[PDB]
């Protein structure tokens, strides 16, 4: 029955600013006898969800005071005054008055910081992996910002496509930057067939596209 809808789904806040989030229920969540059990949980990258506010404004243990719960009946809001690197992750609201229990859609939170260009590295296929019969070339765009970043492979100045896939890490709780890995996959054969392997990275933080390459195969 009950439907918990959070908003926004995403939220870009500047280190130090104030953040606000809403959780609207389908019906009053005032547990008949007593009060209203509306909680706020927060999940940080690679961790488990953790309690923040229980009843509605009730702040759990070691939780800073920057967090404050509020609202009643069908409108609740979680506010974080003076946001920072650590508060990164997804926030969720939970209704614990009516069964079945309900979980909010989930509001993500990314931290905006000054522009940082990616540092590029390029690794040729291991010898051990070549014995196998396949070669994996890996390009690394390390600690950059914003998230957007292009990567193109060129085997002998020839552009490539549909033979490589990427993977981006989640914003770092430290410097709030991203990292990306690209892997060019080719058969041991075709790899022997060429000479120059290059990785060309494009980013807002770069004034002129940077390139990393190597001559072997």
């Amino acid at each position: 029955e009950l439907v918990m809808t959070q908003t926004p789904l995403s939220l870009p806040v500047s280190l130090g600013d104030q953040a606000s989030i809403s959780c609207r229920s389908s019906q009053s969540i005032v547990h008949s006898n007593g009060n209203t059990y509306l909680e706020w949980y927060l999940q940080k990258p690679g961790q488990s969800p953790k309690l923040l506010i229980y009843k509605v404004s009730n702040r759990f243990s070691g939780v800073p005071d920057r967090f404050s719960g509020s609202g009643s009946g069908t409108d609740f809001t979680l506010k974080i005054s003076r946001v920072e690197a650590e508060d990164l992750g997804v926030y969720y609201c939970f209704q614990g008055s009516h069964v079945p229990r309900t979980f909010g859609g989930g509001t993500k939170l990314e931290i905006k910081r000054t522009v940082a260009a990616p540092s590029v590295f390029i690794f040729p296929p291991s010898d051990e992996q070549l014995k196998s019969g396949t070669a994996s070339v890996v390009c690394l765009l390390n600690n950059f910002y914003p998230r957007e970043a292009k990567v193109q492979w060129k085997v002998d100045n020839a552009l490539q496509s549909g033979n490589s896939q990427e993977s981006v890490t989640e914003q770092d709780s430290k410097d709030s930057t991203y990292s990306l890995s690209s892997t060019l996959t080719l058969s041991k054969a075709d790899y022997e067939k060429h000479k120059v392997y290059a990785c060309e990275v494009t980013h807002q933080g770069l004034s002129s596209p940077v390139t990393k390459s190597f001559n072997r195969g």
Partner: protein
């Protein structure tokens, strides 16, 4: 003090069963309601159901999404929480958590146990080195890592030098190769001056295939 450790996760054929367990310690197990909550990779949390404390006849409640197909129970003389699942489908694939509920809501959560529903069989990965490219181009700072390739199912653990190495360590999200086998890299950045006095080893561990590998990355 309070400890909630779940297990029993792993790979399972579509249509089969798998019972999960959650070990607790550090509080009066029978005074609390015990909850089960799953989360598919990259998606939102989904309340599954709970079992009330003793004061309420240990009654169970389930989420419409799993009711009748899933069951919860508890061993009080041992303080263990259970979750029996049946006729599992591919979508049931997720990380399952347990938590206790009481005067402070779900104040304590477990670290989770991952589940995968697939007809595909287990497979240990192969680990190759992302060697500090010899002529490490214009840079006093070098990058090196390990390539964990061709494994199934997820997940795979990767630490450096038994955990001691933590600075500038990035483990990327696994991706699916056209072969239906996962793959992922783990990098670390350090000074190029020390590529002769230091040692770097990635300790990769799988589990669904009982695989442990400690590969020492070298220039």
């Amino acid at each position: 003090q309070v400890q909630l450790v779940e297990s029993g996760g792993g790979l399972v054929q579509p249509g089969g069963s798998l019972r999960l367990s959650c070990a607790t310690s550090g509080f009066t197990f029978t005074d609390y309601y015990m909850s089960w909550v799953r989360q598919p990779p990259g998606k939102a949390l989904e309340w599954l159901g709970f079992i009330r404390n003793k004061a309420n006849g240990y009654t169970t409640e389930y989420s419409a999404s799993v009711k009748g197909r899933f069951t919860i129970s508890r061993d009080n003389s041992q303080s263990i929480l259970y979750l029996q699942m049946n006729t599992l489908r591919a979508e049931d694939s997720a990380t399952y958590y347990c938590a206790r509920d009481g005067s402070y809501a779900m104040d304590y959560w477990g670290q989770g146990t991952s589940v995968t529903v697939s007809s595909a069989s287990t497979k240990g990965p192969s680990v190759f080195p992302l060697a500090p490219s010899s002529k490490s181009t214009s840079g006093g700072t070098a990058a090196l890592g390990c390539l964990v390739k061709d494994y199934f199912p997820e997940p795979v653990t990767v630490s450096w030098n038994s955990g001691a190495l933590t600075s500038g360590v990035h483990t990327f999200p696994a991706v699916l190769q056209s072969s239906g086998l996962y793959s992922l890299s783990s990098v670390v950045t350090v000074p190029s001056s020390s590529l002769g006095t230091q040692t770097y080893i990635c300790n990769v561990n799988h589990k669904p295939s009982n695989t442990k590998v400690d590969k020492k990355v070298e220039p």
